[PDB]
Each structure stands twice: as C-alpha cells, then as structure tokens.
Design an enzyme around this catalytic site. Structure first.
Site, short mmCIF file in Angstrom:
data_model
loop_
_atom_site.label_atom_id
_atom_site.label_comp_id
_atom_site.label_asym_id
_atom_site.label_seq_id
_atom_site.Cartn_x
_atom_site.Cartn_y
_atom_site.Cartn_z
N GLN B 16 -2.59 -15.60 -1.90
CA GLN B 16 -2.64 -14.22 -1.36
C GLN B 16 -3.95 -13.42 -1.61
OE1 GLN B 16 -0.41 -9.78 -1.30
NE2 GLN B 16 0.87 -11.52 -2.04
N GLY B 259 1.42 13.16 -10.33
CA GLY B 259 0.29 14.05 -10.58
C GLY B 259 0.55 15.43 -11.22
#
Ligand SMILES: CC(C)(COP(=O)(O)OP(=O)(O)OC[C@H]1O[C@@H](n2cnc3c(N)ncnc32)[C@H](O)[C@@H]1OP(=O)(O)O)[C@@H](O)C(=O)NCCC(=O)NCCS
Lengths: 427, 427
Positions: B16, B259
C-alpha cells in the site's frame, strides 16, 4: 540546498489545515508571509493557551518559519498592498471558505492578470461543484464526511473519531502536494494554476482501502477477514450475534488489520494501570511457522485449521487471545524486542509522553526543540521527509504583526508611508 | 498540461504505502514502470480476491496508471537491465525494508554514479538512525508507533487504530511531497537526491496536535476541554471516576473535538440498527447564539455558565446530551440541514455505501469509475487535489508482466534478446 528557497508564499491561512501546509513549506525553505486580521489574527493564538497573553502551543507548533503582517483587506490601501504582494508571490494559500477571496476583489481571473505566474491554492470542506460545496467543516466533521468515522472504532460502539488529524493537517499535506505539482508544471508552461483540496477528499484518499472493502462486500456479501465473519465472536450491545448476513456497508472492525494483513491490539503488563501498555501483533501469512515457535505451538505448524489464511478465519480471535497470554508478564518493549528476534511485525503503542522525550526522534529531527527566547523553548514535529542534501532549520513562530514594517520595506515603502498605514488602521 | 508528463518512475514498490505514492504520480502524468517479482509479483494481487484468478481490488485500486515488468533482480542479466533503466529514470521509489537494494548492488553511491540526476525515494518503518530502524512495520504497527492509537478511542477502552490508512497511504502521500520537493530542487542544482519517509514520522506529523496536548499537560497538569476534566463524567471500567489528577500522558478522548472547538458524535434516528446514523456537532464559540435558537433554549444566551468557552467547559457533556435529544426522531440528513439553516458546523457520518454511490463525488472526479475491460469495471478514489488546467486520466492496473516486452523494446533491445530472457527465467 533547500527545495523551496526563494519561493515566496503569501499565506492567508488560519487554524490547522492551511497553516500546516505553509509551515511545512517554510521548513523546506519557502519565505512564508502570513497575513493576519488586525487586532486578533489567527484564532489559534488565543486557543488553549498555557500561559496568559502568550501565543498558544496550537499557534506556535503550526506557525514556525513564517513572518506575520497584520492587514485589513477591506480597505482601499490594503487591497493596493495585496496587489503588490501578489506580484512578488509564487504561491498564495488560503482556507477562508468559499467565495471569500472573490468578495475581496481577488477572483482567480484578476489574480492571473496581476501575476500570470502565481499559483492559487485552497483548502475547502467539499470540492467545488459538490452539492455540499457550501457546508461548514472542522476536523471531525470532515472525518465524518469522508468515511473514516464510520469505519473506525468498534462494531458495538459509535463511529469514532481518529486522534490524528485526518481532516486538517492531512488536507494540509495534500494541498502541499498540489502546490508542488503546480510548481513542477510552471517550469514547463510559465503559468500558475488554481489548486484546491477538499477535506472530505483528503480523508477519503486515506480510507481508499475501505472503498476496496465496500465493493468486495457488494459483490461477494462477505469480508472474511473482519471479526464479524468469525461465527459467534461479535455481538451488538443486546447480546445478539453479528455476521455479514445483515451488513451492506463496511463496518467497524475494532483493532483488525485493515491493509495490514491480520492483526490485533494485545495487552502487555500493566494495562490496568497504564492506558498505553499494549502492542500491535500481526499474523503475516508468510510468517506462520515463526509465530508457532515463539508461542510454543509446534502442533499448529502442520494442522490445516491453523496454517493458511483460510483455516485461520474459523478461529482468528482465539489465536489472538492465546498470544496475548504470553505477553502477560512483559512490557511492550520486551514484547517488541522478543517479536523482533523472529522477524514478526510487532510494535508498541507509544504514548505521547514517550514520544515527546524519545531520544531517537530528536536525533533524526522528527521531534524538534524550537528555540523561542520570547515564549520559552517548545517541542514540535519537524519534517517527516529526510533528504540527503539538506536539513530544515526551524525557527520560532512570529508574534502578531512582528514583521509588518520589515515586510513593507521589502515592498519599497518609505518610513512615513508606513506611519500613515498604522494610523489609517490598515496595518 | 500534466505536472509529471515525461517524469519516468522506476517503481519497486509493493503493498500500500509505496504503490499509493507511485499511483498518485501516475495520475499526475508520470510514466510509472512497476518492477514485479517473477511469478507472483506484488502480493496484493492475490490478497482478498473477489473473483478467482483475477487481481484483487487491493491491487487495482493502488496500481492504475502503471505498467508491469517482471524481473529477477538476483541475476547478472537483470542487474544489467536495471542499470539501463536507472539511467532513464527520474525517480526510483522503493519500500523493501532496510539495506535491501544495497544488497542487490544498488547503494545510493552506485546509483549516483549511474545517474547523477535520479532521485531515490523510500518508505521505511522508522527513520534512518532510529534505534528501531530495523523493526518490521505494517499499517497498524505504525499507527501505534506514531501516537495515533494511544490517542484514539475511549478512556475506558484500548488504544484504537483508525480505519483511515494513517500508516500506509498517508506515508506514501508524504513521500510524494518529498519526491516533488526533490524535483523542484533539481531544477536549481541539476542533481538528484535521496529522500525517505518513515511511517512512524508520517503518523506523528498528523498527530502534532497531540504533541501540543502533551506539552500543555506537562506545563499545566490539565486539559480543560477533554472529557476527563468535567467532574464525574468519565469512569474507567470498574466503577471509578477519572480526572487529570492521575494523567501524565495525553489520554483518549472518545469523540471530543480535538482542537479549541468542542464537539461530539450524536445519535440520530435509527442508530440502534444503523451503525452510521449519527451526526457530528461542533460548538463553535461565535455560533453559540444560533445554537441556542436551533435548540430553543434562549436562557443560555446570557447565563455565563453557558455563553463562554470558560463557562461551557465543565458542563460540555450535559449539553451534547441535550442536543442529542433533539435529534432522536430525525435522520442524519434532516439534522444537518436543520443545522445548515443556522450555519452551525454539523454533518453526517457518511457510510461507505453512501460514499461509494454518491453522485457529487463522481461529478468532481473524486470517486471514479475505472474502465477495466479484462476484470470488470470498479470504483477507486482519484486525485484529491483539483487543478484549473488539467484532469487526471485513470487507466486500469496492469496484468502481471503485461508490459515486459514493450519495456524491454523501449530499452533498445532486440526481439531475440527478449525471448532469451524469458527462457533464461529472468523476465
Ligand atoms: C475554518 C473556517 C470554518 C472558519 O470560518 P469563519 O470563522 O467563518 O472564518 P472565514 O474564513 O469564513 O472568514 C471570515 C470573514 O472575514 C473575512 N476576513 C478574514 N480575515 C480578514 C482580514 N484580514 N481583513 C479583512 N477581512 C478578513 C473573510 O473574507 C470572511 O468574509 P465573509 O464574511 O465574506 O465570508 C473556514 O475558514 C472554512 O470552512 N475553511 C475551509 C475548511 C477549513 O480550513 N476548516 C477547518 C479549520 S483548520
């Protein structure tokens, strides 16, 4: 010497997605001029502060290697200044939400007329032309819109947000590919381009393996390697069993392998007392013998109920339980070092404390001590790309408007033209 | 008109991380020539196949816009072909595990001697010079080594992997930045560079906000906006409350905002039988008034326990718990649309089935149907960056060895030589 030496970036960005991108350009040598609103500037400055009236870590860890100029872009004189700066810039980066720059007067069309060479780069929530083009998006909303949240966490729990910033910083790094690609095309055309990344698409790109799985599911009705495909292993919150008889959309698989071959999150000594006292252990099919030696199960080397991917599906989670048992008495590090003797892919869950003080990450420049004489030194994540031919030189994040005057001199403005602008509340 | 037109990529990559990067280069125009093991090639070909004797979706959704040549690199004759190809290459991408190419004879130093212009780009588990430089690493192992797993999931559960491929595709996109930055620098120096991305550091870069949190925690002893800091909301598994009294490393926060702007994952109608029937709902600071009207609780506009971030961050869970009740009888999309009426940042968890057939994602070219006349058509994610001056052209993955001869003939070889190599079992 430094890939973006001499690339100047007119940076309008705020928060995480846009600033992450300009910071990383700064780390590769770009001259980033960050444009900030008069008075407050980038929100992050006042968000989650650790000392009052000091720029937060949120701000400093996303705004090193930049200068700050304040500017009211609504004013005739600010627009004039912007035009001059656009003519000197190589890239303008923005994450303002749709139409906003156009409303300041700086459509792509006019920008091209000001500087046919400048690249215009944007982060948005959804792609231009998407029905949801207009929606408002922060980190976790985009993880939701992009497929990560549905495919993360457990079968008996909610969609789960990833700790990593799949939506902000990841959009940022995607944008930074776009920007560099556009700089590469400019060497051949002499022209700038518009380039935009959408948080949903950035997320989706990282969950591409789940769009593999959706098509697999649609065509075959099953996903053999998921925990729900092991008969009577997985139960919904009511004690009812779970299988791929009911599932038409890719489900949560807990700590299953994903694009990694089969795997799981196993307890190590102290997990009751310590949240991060765990390894990840992977059964690569090519490693079956090695694993049997380690866990002392020679009988399983030849039994076909255990030595192919296929025989293993009947029982995967039982195998994993039995391996866990061996780690019962060893910390993650002993377990990783033991695993490593056999070549098996196995590693510890690193805690953030471990990471912030790891000697290896500071040797290679991935965690870095930034020297900040004003706010106090602080740690940051450097350049995850390592190059043979140079080292980032990270320097501290700018104070609000610190470089406003210095930037106006580089534009060619006399000291009283600068006095005017402060008094006019332009700068 | 296509940013990597005429860039030639000698692609050694498998699985991948590496292939994600070379595929994305191919979408931007690169001439990607994938080198594959004689006989089996890239192991994704036979891993999770949906039809028998047909390359899997894992292989096709990571190997469009490439050609395949088979090659035994342990052979004198195959090393000779390699040298010829390295002289034509602009970049040589690899994810083989450490020292591997050096053992084939192709150290960075010999490569430079062959072609002083070629860029050598690598994906690694850990950075060159790290104590763990030699450990073997797949997706979820890196998520663990990089901080994501430790900071993802719930305070009363285990570290949790993301469904997003933070360790693989993420790493491959960061590599792609390194590659483009080296191409930018080569316009100025005439010289190639070595460039490496480690999976640990790619992860860590997306987990930067968690390094912000570690430092905040170290300096202040607390993270006010984490669930564990609202008194008696959070409990570990056996009946005991949780607080930052005891926490020295950033903890798992369930579906908290990340956040400075709190959020949660909220049930919608159908959640008890539909895994993806939820919404994420973010309390922006400026948006509290509008949130108060959608809700129809107007008492909260002036109650200072309710109208400030400081007021809000001790009742935060009570609040989500009550917004959730408003959504019990409406779906996902209804809730979102109600919330867009107030510009509130709220969106649905999109399921993989919803995303696989979403019409917008197909119009903007982010979910693309690939025309594959040999295996059947399939979907894949296309370019997450959108450009005003070109569109990617997605073209199906190659059959093992499909292009061997073709590529030998571009190397100036003769059809007798070619048929000799096939017979000498080198190609
Ligand atoms: C982050 C985000 C949600 C913030 O939203 P916001 O608080 O409303 O701020 P905006 O970006 O919309 O800008 C506020 C307005 O002031 C203007 N403005 C900002 N700085 C200014 C300045 N220096 N001088 C004059 N005007 C300014 C903007 O043009 C905008 O104008 P508008 O009223 O015409 O829309 C938004 O920028 C966004 O969705 N962008 C894309 C995705 C993203 O980055 N979000 C995740 C955050 S990392």
């Amino acid at each position: 010497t430094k890939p973006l030496d001499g690339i100047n970036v007119l940076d309008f960005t705020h928060v995480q997605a846009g600033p992450a991108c300009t910071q990383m350009m700064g780390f590769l040598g770009a001259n980033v001029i960050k444009i900030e609103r008069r008075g407050s500037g980038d929100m992050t400055r006042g968000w989650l502060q650790d000392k009052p009236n000091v720029d937060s870590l949120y701000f400093t860890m996303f705004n090193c290697n930049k200068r700050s100029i304040e500017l009211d872009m609504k004013t005739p004189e600010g627009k004039e200044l912007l035009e001059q700066m656009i003519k000197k810039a190589d890239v303008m980066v923005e994450n303002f939400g749709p139409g906003a720059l156009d409303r300041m007067g700086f459509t792509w069309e006019y920008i091209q007329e000001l500087n046919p060479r400048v690249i215009l780069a944007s982060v948005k929530g959804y792609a231009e032309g998407h029905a949801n083009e207009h929606l408002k998006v922060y980190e976790n909303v985009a993880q939701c819109s992009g497929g990560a949240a549905a495919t993360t966490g457990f079968w008996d729990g909610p969609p789960t947000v990833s700790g990593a910033a799949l939506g902000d910083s990841n959009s940022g790094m995607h944008l930074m590919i776009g920007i560099l690609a556009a700089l590469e095309i400019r060497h051949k055309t002499g022209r700038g381009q518009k380039v935009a990344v959408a948080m949903q698409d950035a997320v989706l790109n990282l969950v591409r393996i789940k769009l593999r799985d959706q098509q697999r599911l649609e065509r075959t009705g099953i996903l053999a390697e998921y925990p729900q495909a092991q008969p009577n292993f997985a139960f919904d919150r009511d004690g009812n069993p779970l299988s791929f008889d009911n599932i038409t959309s890719v489900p949560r698989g807990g700590n299953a392998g994903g694009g990694g071959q089969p795997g799981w999150m196993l307890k190590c000594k102290g997990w009751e007392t310590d949240a991060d006292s765990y390894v990840y252990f992977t059964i690569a099919a090519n490693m079956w013998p090695q694993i049997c030696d380690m866990i002392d199960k020679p009988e399983w080397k030849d039994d076909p109920a255990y030595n192919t991917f296929e025989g293993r599906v009947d029982k995967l989670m039982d195998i994993f339980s039995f391996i866990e048992t061996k780690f019962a008495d060893k910390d993650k590090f002993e377990v990783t070092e033991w695993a490593a003797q056999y070549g098996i892919p196995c590693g510890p869950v690193m805690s953030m404390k471990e990471l912030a003080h790891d000697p290896s990450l500071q040797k290679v420049g991935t965690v870095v001590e930034v020297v900040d004489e004003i706010r106090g030194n602080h740690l940051t994540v450097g350049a995850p790309f390592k190059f043979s031919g140079f080292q980032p030189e990270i320097t501290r994040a700018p104070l609000l408007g610190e470089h406003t005057d210095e930037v106006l001199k580089e534009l060619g403005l006399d000291d009283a033209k600068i006095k005017e602008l402060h008094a006019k509340q332009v700068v």
